[PDB]
Amino acid sequence: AFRVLKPWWDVFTDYLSVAMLMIGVFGCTLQVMQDKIICLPKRVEMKGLKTDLDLQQYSFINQMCYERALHWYAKYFPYLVLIHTLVFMLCSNFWFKFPGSSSKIEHFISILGKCFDSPWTTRALSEGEQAKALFEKVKKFRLHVEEGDILYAMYVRQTVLKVIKFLIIIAYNSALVSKVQFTVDCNVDIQDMTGYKNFSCNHTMAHLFSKLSFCYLCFVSIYGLTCLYTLYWLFYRSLREYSFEYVRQETGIDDIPDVKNDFAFMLHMIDQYDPLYSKRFAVFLSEVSENKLKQLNL
Amino acid sequence: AFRVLKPWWDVFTDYLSVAMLMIGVFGCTLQVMQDKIICLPKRVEMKGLKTDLDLQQYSFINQMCYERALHWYAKYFPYLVLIHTLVFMLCSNFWFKFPGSSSKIEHFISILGKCFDSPWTTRALDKKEGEQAKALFEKVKKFRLHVEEGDILYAMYVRQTVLKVIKFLIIIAYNSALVSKVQFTVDCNVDIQDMTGYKNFSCNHTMAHLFSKLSFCYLCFVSIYGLTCLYTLYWLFYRSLREYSFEYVRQETGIDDIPDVKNDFAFMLHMIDQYDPLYSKRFAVFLSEVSENKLKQLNL
Amino acid sequence: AFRVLKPWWDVFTDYLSVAMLMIGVFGCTLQVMQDKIICLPKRVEMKGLKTDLDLQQYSFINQMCYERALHWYAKYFPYLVLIHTLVFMLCSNFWFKFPGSSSKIEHFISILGKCFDSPWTTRALSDKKEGEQAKALFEKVKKFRLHVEEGDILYAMYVRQTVLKVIKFLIIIAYNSALVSKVQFTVDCNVDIQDMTGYKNFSCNHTMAHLFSKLSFCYLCFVSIYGLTCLYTLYWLFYRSLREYSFEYVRQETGIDDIPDVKNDFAFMLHMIDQYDPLYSKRFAVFLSEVSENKLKQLNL
Amino acid sequence: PAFRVLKPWWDVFTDYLSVAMLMIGVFGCTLQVMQDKIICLPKRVEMKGLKTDLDLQQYSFINQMCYERALHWYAKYFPYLVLIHTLVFMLCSNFWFKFPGSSSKIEHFISILGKCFDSPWTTRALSEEGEQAKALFEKVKKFRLHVEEGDILYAMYVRQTVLKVIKFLIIIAYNSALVSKVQFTVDCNVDIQDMTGYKNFSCNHTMAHLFSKLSFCYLCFVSIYGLTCLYTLYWLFYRSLREYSFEYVRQETGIDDIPDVKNDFAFMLHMIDQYDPLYSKRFAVFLSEVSENKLKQLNL
Amino acid sequence: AFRVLKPWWDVFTDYLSVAMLMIGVFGCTLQVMQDKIICLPKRVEMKGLKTDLDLQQYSFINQMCYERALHWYAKYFPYLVLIHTLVFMLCSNFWFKFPGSSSKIEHFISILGKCFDSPWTTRALSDKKEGEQAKALFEKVKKFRLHVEEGDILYAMYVRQTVLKVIKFLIIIAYNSALVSKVQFTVDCNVDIQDMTGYKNFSCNHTMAHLFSKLSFCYLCFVSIYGLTCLYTLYWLFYRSLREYSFEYVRQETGIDDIPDVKNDFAFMLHMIDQYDPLYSKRFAVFLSEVSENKLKQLNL
């Protein structure tokens, strides 16, 4: 189910994405509740000024104001939060398990699942026909996957997209997150239908839709930085053509070669989850054990 | 099944975390359907004072006072408690979820489970039995050599302990010193007289007494948890548990050839020994070469 | 699965305790959901008392009256019951769930279970691997005798738990009987809010009061039952010294005058288990006589 | 959960009727806490409307004072009485599968019956392996020593029926006498004369036309559960359920060696017969020493 | 499972019952949301007439009229539909689970399955295990012929269900047919509440009546169809003497002029199952004459 190959450079991002969707859900709920703007007519003991206006007129006032005095973001922030969150969620997860190359990753998953528990591997690390069948599958998988370049340039594309969107989001929420102000001074000209021209407006949910904005800014900064670290690892160790050189001096069989391309990426990544399936794969990825099993079967 | 890997410390701690979550959820629920400031104009059988104010002017007054009069905490003690509770919860569950210290712990747990049902240990204290014993000894040597050098399990627990103590202290301070800024009858002096006219208003906040009591409850529970974490940190610092000593096992079973485990095995020992200080002796079975030679001979 | 060790007393108490929580929840539901104290100014054919008051001043009147006139409990009746019930539920279940006190329970239960299905027990009640298993059970019995027959870790906690529960019953009966005559359904309030509304001495009614009185009466009755059960526990835990046992009945029934009498924690364990089913006691105690072990060894030999 | 093998028809009908009573009570409470209460009006004891001139608050106070001082004993808290009574009558049907005194024998009978009806030795003998059946046979000997020893399980279904009948009779009485008095047009007289002004008021109970019907339904349902319980109590002392003997089964299987069980075996076996008259033969096979000797010979 | 065990009347009953339940659900949903009796006082350029009455006097008037002027059925056209629907549902799936009352037909079903699938039928109408298979089938056939053709526990329940169905159908049809002429959009209330509200005689319109009438006709029509199916059961149950069978075609078609004529429960079940599939009858009747057993014994020798 691919859960084996998922570096900590790809799980904290999923968790932070869940949190972002949660903040968006709370914001959407809040904007669902409440009553929005509640504006009154300015007049440009302590008995009060009888405004004298009928209720539908006040609904006309409080509808004209909340579409001619509230800025680009302050009225529709929750929608932007949800859109960016869904974009990031789809971009990260679905990228690798795409349509173009879903087959190779799944088949490598199957081969790794088989070779993780090979009985002949257990014996040699201290069934024979099974070892031969596994060797055949390994050789075919090598000739098919190692002869490949797809599953390499999809993680680079996904991380690049994620980092680009992180930059864009920080930019957008930078500027227009200082224009969410409670008081406002609407000056519209609904003057013959209503009677009082210039009116004052005091949005209801602005305190929250500033604090939620601060929190979303923090979470987006964290996810941006983590994607930054992944983009750092992905281009500072040349993780193509991995090297089972320490494996050779580590296990004794000094003929185990170095896989390349998609095999290299799969190994270097699945190395991060648990640095032990590398040995179990390298066991079947050696030629001398093949002839040894051939002799033993005889 | 991490059951033996959970001392009394991180049992009382988790239960108190659940209680804190309950108080936070109830507080939020009460903050939802309990209205808000019900402010009214001030005048700074008896016929009532006809105040002459419309049905939206009063709403303007309420939604100006409930956001420029009532003090900081008294408006968001529910959410702040919820956030701090979530952090305190997901700050004591990383020694079992973070990659890089997890699979080794799982293997250690499985191995510790393995070396329990040993008839040879009963014999020490069926050809498969001898082969099973030898395989157990070999796997024990393998896992021990695996976890005996990089000992990040007397480190990560230390970091979690220090951070949890820090958070307890900060939370107690900030929710104690300001715990006296929630009152019933606050007086608002807001200057909006061109629209309504009345210049100084009085506001009674609805849920402003069930929150002081709730904050007292949260302070008490958090103080208990702070003391518990402090004592855990004190115990896990009273002596260097980075090296163990099964001198009792040696003096008891006559197997005096096993050395003193350290580092990762020290962590596992000194911790598991808190669950039930007898399964420790079980590992002592797969720790002597004398028994290994005896079993190898018994195979013949 | 520690269902074997649960005396008849705690057999009902836990159930009753769960029941208490139910009342708590219901009470809370009736507080937030329903309305609250209503009120009206007092002027202290037919007619109509026309008293102008815009329908916000009435809200201020209600929400000052029902916070400065209703007594200490009737506003907070549910939360107290929930809190005390959770306290009792925690107290009753920290005797089989305490680290450093539960491993003995597990070891004793495992040993007793191994003894219960013992076929060598059937043989001694009047193969080589079978005899080896019999000797293994005898050795396990010797180990358990050497380990869990010394300290009263599980003979000093049950008494403490009973003491705490009895104290809670006392304090709860006291408080919930004290004020339960101070929760009434017509209160007369006098706050000095006069410059802002006009009428300075008002009458008010707490809507959900005559029901809260009855619910609290029910809570008092159920708590008195739970206290009675705890009292019987404290009378069957202090009139017979269950920390010094003697299997004289098994000696009479089996004929072997060679099984000794366990004491202290083993005595506690045996005595408690004896209240679940009066059979496992003899099956466990049989595999402790030297004649039985000698017979098993001789059959092996 | 296997807690079905011992359940006569009486138990199934009792559970179903209990479910229906619970539903009636739930719907009633939901109604009583989701609509309008009594809605009272002031009494002045072409044309024109009789203007009353009283604000909303005063009217709400009139309603709340009247409809807590005029409506009689039952008609206000009706649904709660049905809920409590249904809870009791649902609790009585459980002190024979939870109480310690009867749980063990019940579970042992369950397991032994499950094994006994699933024995190829039954196909061997009734048509007229080795130690595993003997283990069951020894377990049967083990079972038929902890069981056939006295009257424990045949006290529960001979006492629980008594209490159920008693409480059903009582509830029939107390919902029979206090069901003539849930009226629609009631009159209240509160001395609220300085607050509102009028002295005697009239009040119609809003949802009172459904309480009479719901109470009729509850009266019929309690009648049914009472009759079923009465029948079971009559059975528990009319036909001798304290001594069974598979004598007809003795003729049907031919092996005239099966024993004559008593007390606990009597109640457990007869009620096992009630559910399906095929467990009796399916188990009685592993109860004859001749069958045991036949199995012993089969081992060789 | 029981798919072959459903007559045409059974499927028609299931369908009509589902329709009835749906109609009742729709009616209940409507009655929840919109039904409300409205009323106003009656006083015997166009200028308005000011009734002069407050906002609770109208509530008292409406909630007195809508309980003293609308008749018994009109109050709940939905309740009676729901109850009769539940009753018909209970009548459904009645004979099949009375005591356990399932093995009594499960044996017949297993017998029919084993009878259809035997090669011996093809061989007769044209190994040791097949000879053993025929022997086992014959033994089971004898056991069922003795057990099934022994009394009345498979004819009483279904017949009683049919009788109850006919009775309920006729009763509900009569009741909803006699008094459907009282649902209307105008009702004239003359209540005696005059010293309190003042306007003595009032007129009322019932909100959702001119729909309930139509729905009522709907129910009647639908119920009629179901009832007609029940009537056909009277045709099926009371005309044919299915309690006696006769292998009139078995001897003519398979050549074995010895196939017996079943009686009582077996005969009725055969006459029924003939409706579902007219092939299993010969399959079961193959093991109904001693000729088949003799042939099986000869071939297995």
Added chain:
Amino acid sequence: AFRVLKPWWDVFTDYLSVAMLMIGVFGCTLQVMQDKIICLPKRVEMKGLKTDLDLQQYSFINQMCYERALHWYAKYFPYLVLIHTLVFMLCSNFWFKFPGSSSKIEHFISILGKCFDSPWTTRALSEDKKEGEQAKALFEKVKKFRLHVEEGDILYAMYVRQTVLKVIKFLIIIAYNSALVSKVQFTVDCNVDIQDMTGYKNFSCNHTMAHLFSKLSFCYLCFVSIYGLTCLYTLYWLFYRSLREYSFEYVRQETGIDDIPDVKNDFAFMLHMIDQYDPLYSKRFAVFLSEVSENKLKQLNL
């Protein structure tokens, strides 16, 4: 499943009915939420006209007018659409489940499945112990089934009946919907005779959900015609082929064995119908329809 038993005519309808059910459900759901006239009294810088009418009397006016002044279909369209959709659906799904006509269809399907995938069928048309025994068993089963089925015409009429009923109901629907469709309007003018109670006589009422509901009905009517047209097309396959007489003519030339005759009546209907899903199961069935093939199977068994 009766996969072979569904022509194109049985394909379009099975989903057009689902669409009709959706339209009806949405119409009813909307009707349940927002509706009902909002009437006002008539008079048979600008300042409004005070009316002096309470907030209950106006409700009574609304409920009397929107019950005695708006025409039948406009008042209850959605019920009508749901009912007609259910009826057409059930009529469609009758014959393939009717008592007395179902088991025969299952037997036909079983025979077809046996004959299509058969090593004997492949071998015979290409130019053992288990194979020979199975071939003999199939030959006997087919010989019995032909006389067991080709005796009457029960299941080859019900298709004619179902087609006739669907076409008739399509005619009826395209009648009623076209007729009572100009009676859905927005502004109606009601004259109730209630003057002593509310005071005004001639009232006007702007209905809501009309210039939407009416439009939906047009939609429905169009989609309804679809079903009817499809049924009419199936009528060509009904009474133009005389399908009650099958003619296995091409098989005897294209397979080489001129010993299988042409079926009639019920078998003819079943074969012609199954021939519209894949024009090859016919030959694979006719493989076990020649006497020479049975003789060869017997000889290979012998």
